Amino acid sequence: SNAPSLISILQAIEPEVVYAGYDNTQPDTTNYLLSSLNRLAEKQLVSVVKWAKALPGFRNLHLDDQMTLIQYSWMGLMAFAMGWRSYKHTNGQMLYFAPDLIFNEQRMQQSAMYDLCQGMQQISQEFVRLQVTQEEFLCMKALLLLSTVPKEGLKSQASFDEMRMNYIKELNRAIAKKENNSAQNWQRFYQLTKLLDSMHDLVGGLLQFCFYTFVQSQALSVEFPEMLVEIISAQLPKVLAGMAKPLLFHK
Ligand SMILES: CC#C[C@]1(O)CC[C@H]2[C@@H]3CCC4=CC(=O)CCC4=C3[C@@H](c3ccc(N(C)C)cc3)C[C@@]21C
Ligand SMILES: CC#C[C@]1(O)CC[C@H]2[C@@H]3CCC4=CC(=O)CCC4=C3[C@@H](c3ccc(N(C)C)cc3)C[C@@]21C
Ligand SMILES: CC(=O)[C@H]1CC[C@H]2[C@@H]3CCC4=CC(=O)CC[C@]4(C)[C@H]3CC[C@]12C
């Protein structure tokens, strides 16, 4: 309580932005865009793992819970942070994958996943509409890691549930700082948690494309780096068996 707030810790451990290493002089083509996003995903994946290990409460989970949460959440976390970066850097008009890999209309079209790009942009436009604050975002991003679990339950169910309640309490703390009335805070919590819930449907779409391009990678000439291959190969069978379920705030 005089302890450093959870928010101050989340601010301290928030990763720095990852560069794609993209050559912007190349023409916009499907396999160079998709292979480059996968190379970016590989670098963001090490960032995410490092961030997750520092997240207060996370290391108290069983190691199999930790790995499972990561497998189930990586796409959503990266998609959610992209919504944030697109909001802060382009007011939701473009997809800010990295400072050196920004998608405009032409690149979204050449990516072969135009509709999904639009999905991702709609998330960014909801950040813009709510004017999400940095403190809200960081709490929401933690909660997103804790929002897809095994149907069978986790090995550390009590520790997980306590951790989830602590991050929800911190999101409400971040909201109440603006010093609005209580009813306004309720509304804000509702809007932010709707935004979180809306990630699940987007992610399902993103997963469908990713899994397809993964299975067809040779024929499409779309490169998947080693760690991405590992996490997709692990996740794909569990999703197929329907082992994961979303934890929704709203029915
Ligand atoms: C209708 C139909 C059809 C299909 O021809 C079979 C699977 C489709 C694929 C599935 C999974 C899929 C998911 C999407 O969300 C957008 C499109 C999509 C497709 C299609 C597609 C077309 C081109 C690529 N490239 C070049 C990487 C990738 C996917 C159309 C696909 C191939
Ligand atoms: C082979 C294999 C495998 C996997 O089970 C799927 C994805 C792996 C992930 C890749 C992406 C990845 C990137 C890293 O930087 C270190 C580890 C790592 C992993 C794995 C992993 C192991 C332990 C944790 N903890 C305890 C937080 C987190 C991640 C091993 C993963 C999950
Ligand atoms: C090549 C491919 O299948 C695409 C479809 C969805 C794409 C991901 C969409 C979410 C995303 C956000 C980032 O900021 C890193 C790149 C990623 C992680 C994208 C990597 C390439 C993906 C996985």
Residue numbers in the entry: -2 to 248
The authors write:
SRs have a modular domain architecture consisting of a highly variable N-terminal domain, a DNA-binding domain (DBD), a short hinge region, and a ligand binding domain (LBD). Agonist binding drives a conformational change, whereby helices 3, 4, and 12 (H3, H4, H12, respectively) create a docking surface for coregulatory proteins termed the activation function surface (AF-H). Recent studies have utilized ancestral steroid receptors (ancSRs) to identify the molecular mechanisms that dictated the evolution of ligands specificity among SRs. Here we report the structure of the ancestral 3-ketosteroid receptor, ancestral steroid receptor 2 (ancSR2), the ancestor of the AR, PR, MR, and GR.
Attempts to determine the crystal structure of the ancSR2–mifepristone complex via ligand exchanged resulted instead in a crystal structure of ancSR2–progesterone with mifepristone bound at two surface sites. Surprisingly, Fo-Fc omit electron density shows clear evidence for the presence of progesterone within the LBP suggesting that mifepristone failed to exchange with this steroid hormone in vitro despite being in nearly 500-fold molar excess. However, initial Fo-Fc electron density clearly showed two well-ordered mifepristone molecules located at distinct surface sites on the receptor which we refer to as “site-one” and “site-two”. Site-one mifepristone makes extensive hydrophobic contacts along helices 3, 7, and 10 of the monomer within the asymmetric unit (AU) and with helices 9 and 10 and the C-terminus of a crystallographic symmetry mate. Surprisingly, a second surface mifepristone was bound to the interface of helices 3, 4, and 12, which is used to recruit coregulator proteins to drive transcriptional activation. Site-two mifepristone is coordinated by extensive hydrophobic interactions at the coactivator cleft with an interface surface area of 402.6 Å2.
